[PDB]
Amino acid sequence: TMGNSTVLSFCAFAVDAAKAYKDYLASGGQPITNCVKMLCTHTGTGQAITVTPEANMDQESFGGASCCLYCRCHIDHPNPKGFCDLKGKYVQIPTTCANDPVGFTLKNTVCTVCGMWKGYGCSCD
């Protein structure tokens, strides 16, 4: 098992950190841990990213920044204003994927319409 600081270091100095984290996971690597899990009722909306925790019965809630590879790596966000969609918000992850929230937020996309994760509850189809 690799620990957090070895993975994080490895990705942070990659020219493409997101590709390194994915390629690492694909090879069977141990996911980044110590994301900040939230106590909450699990009666929330199920929206992906929210101002307070919004988990439904099928989700967990985390502190957004602790689930963001770039925040966890202390590097610039790949958005040309450098702005973070998770910093200071709360992210709702499906409980099945809650063992790798950093990987989940990376690999996935919020539906422009729903508000929920495309492919994971987004009902729109």
Binding residues for Zn(2+), as ranges, are 68, 71, 77, 84, 111, 114, 122, 124
**Interface region with Zn ion, contact rule CB under 5 A, candidates 18-26, 48-56, 95-103, 106-114:** 106-114
Please identify which residue in 38, 84, 98, 110 interacts with Zn ion, judged by CB under 5 A. Answer: 84
DSSP letter string over 58-122? TEEEEEGGGG-HHHHHT---SSTT---SSTTSEEEEEGGGTT-HHHHHHH--B-TTTSSBTTTT-
The site map against Zn ion for 64-83 (x = CB under 5 A) is: ----x-xx------------
d(CA 80, CA 59): 31
Question: Contact positions toward Zn ion, by CB under 5 A?
Answer: 68, 70-71, 84, 111, 113-114, 122, 124
